[PDB]
Design a protein around this motif. Structure first.
Motif, short mmCIF file in Angstrom:
data_model
loop_
_atom_site.label_atom_id
_atom_site.label_comp_id
_atom_site.label_asym_id
_atom_site.label_seq_id
_atom_site.Cartn_x
_atom_site.Cartn_y
_atom_site.Cartn_z
N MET A 6 41.43 40.80 52.64
CA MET A 6 42.59 40.66 51.77
C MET A 6 42.27 39.91 50.47
O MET A 6 43.01 40.03 49.49
N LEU A 7 41.16 39.17 50.45
CA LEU A 7 40.77 38.43 49.25
C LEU A 7 39.92 39.26 48.29
O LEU A 7 40.25 39.36 47.11
N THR A 36 37.54 34.49 59.36
CA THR A 36 37.43 35.69 58.55
C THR A 36 38.42 36.76 59.03
O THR A 36 39.07 37.42 58.22
N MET A 37 38.54 36.91 60.35
CA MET A 37 39.39 37.93 60.96
C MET A 37 40.84 37.89 60.52
O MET A 37 41.43 38.94 60.26
N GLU A 38 41.41 36.69 60.43
CA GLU A 38 42.80 36.54 60.01
C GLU A 38 42.98 36.75 58.50
O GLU A 38 44.11 36.82 58.01
N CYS A 39 41.87 36.83 57.77
CA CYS A 39 41.88 37.14 56.34
C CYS A 39 41.62 38.62 56.07
O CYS A 39 41.52 39.05 54.91
N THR A 40 41.50 39.41 57.14
CA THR A 40 41.27 40.85 57.03
C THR A 40 42.48 41.62 57.54
O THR A 40 43.27 41.10 58.33
N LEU A 88 42.74 28.97 45.40
CA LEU A 88 42.37 29.98 44.41
C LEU A 88 43.49 30.29 43.42
O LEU A 88 44.31 31.17 43.68
N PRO A 89 43.51 29.58 42.28
CA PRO A 89 44.51 29.82 41.22
C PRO A 89 44.45 31.23 40.66
O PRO A 89 45.47 31.76 40.22
N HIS A 90 43.26 31.83 40.69
CA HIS A 90 43.05 33.18 40.15
C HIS A 90 43.47 34.29 41.12
O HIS A 90 43.49 35.46 40.73
N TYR A 91 43.79 33.93 42.36
CA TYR A 91 44.15 34.93 43.37
C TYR A 91 45.38 35.73 42.98
O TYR A 91 46.42 35.17 42.63
N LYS A 92 45.25 37.05 43.06
CA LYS A 92 46.34 37.98 42.84
C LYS A 92 46.34 38.99 44.00
O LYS A 92 45.29 39.55 44.32
N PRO A 93 47.51 39.20 44.64
CA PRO A 93 47.58 39.96 45.90
C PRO A 93 47.10 41.40 45.76
O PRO A 93 47.32 42.04 44.74
N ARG A 94 46.42 41.89 46.80
CA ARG A 94 45.86 43.24 46.78
C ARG A 94 46.79 44.28 47.42
O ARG A 94 46.40 45.42 47.64
#
Ligand SMILES: [Zn+2]
Ligand SMILES: [Zn+2]
Lengths: 192, 192
Positions: A6-7, A36-40, A88-94
């Motif tokens: 997701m990142l 990692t798994m919960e971020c996928t 992550l201030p630069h994070y924008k949702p995918r």
């Protein structure tokens, strides 16, 4: 058995994420104290074989240009854990959310450039004067070919009205949230 | 007296570039052995008051999201010196040139995802086998909603034909350079 991060958007098998984690984001996930798994996500669309990230315009537009060569997804469904997001201030949702909110505001024709100069200075002065919470004005811009309008990037109409209050030559009551389909024609280097 | 940096897009007076150089790019210019002045242009358009670079979508699209808050230009005319360009693989010109070249290639409907998988593997194998000069295939992608087509990012038609030669289910003789105006509808996370 395939999942997408997701990142960074990378597509790997469940086994691969289990074994190796994410080749791009593992450091961030470690700092966040998350697996990692919960971020996928098992739900994704738009397969991208990314061969040359540093050169690809596709990579640039998908924010994979500083990531490794590999298979990526254009859309990844799901919510990144908060403990990652806060780092992550630069994070924008995918997933399509957290999107561009740009308002076209009518102004006196011939004052467009002047207004950008004045408002940039205004925001700078407001940041110096105000406390922790600043006015959420992200950017302001004009285009020579689009006379009689300035464009203000801000999440809510109220913010723009608060910002433009008492500023001459801005016609704050005449504004429009620019539809996404009109945004590319708005920011392309060469117009007409 | 105003000029814009050809690398980062920042707008400052000639005096300011003379005094302070570029706040974003000075390290690069130092390594390149070039003056800040020759990396700036008196010809620019599209004033951007950039207030929150890390959050702004405008900043993201203009590649100023990792640069300082300030005044930027959307279009900067002129050619960056070669000794700067050779240091920065990620550099993309701010004059409109060096643009996205994406080719829509017809393929057998239902084989789109499969083809991306196969071609990504093919390019990986070609890089391992070939010498210094690789096939200039930057990326390849599909969209679920656009059946019967894959999209190949490469600078020239010849490269794509060379790459797709002898690959089943790719209809290489039926292709189209996607016009810039169609590109946003092609890569937006949510279609229709
Ligand atoms: Zn990742
Ligand atoms: Zn610069």
């Amino acid at each position: 058995s395939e999942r997408a991060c997701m990142l960074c958007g990378i597509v790997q098998t469940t086994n691969e994420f289990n074994r190796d984690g994410c080749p791009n984001c593992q450091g961030i996930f470690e700092e966040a104290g998350v697996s990692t798994m919960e971020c996928t996500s098992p739900s994704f669309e738009g397969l991208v074989g990314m061969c040359k990230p540093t050169k690809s315009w596709v990579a640039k537009w998908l924010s994979v240009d500083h990531s490794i060569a590999g298979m990526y997804a254009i859309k990844v469904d799901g919510r990144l854990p908060a403990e990652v997001v806060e780092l992550l201030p630069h994070y924008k949702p995918r997933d399509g959310s957290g999107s561009a909110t740009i308002w076209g505001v009518r102004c006196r024709p011939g004052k467009e450039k002047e207004l950008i100069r004045k408002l940039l200075k205004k925001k700078f002065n407001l940041d110096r004067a105000m406390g922790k919470k600043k006015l959420k004005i992200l950017s302001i811009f004009q285009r020579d070919n689009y006379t009689g309008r300035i464009y203000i990037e801000a999440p809510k109409q109220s913010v723009i009205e608060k910002f433009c209050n008492g500023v001459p030559d801005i016609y704050i009551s005449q504004k429009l949230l620019i539809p996404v389909q009109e945004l590319p024609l708005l920011l392309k280097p060469n117009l007409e």
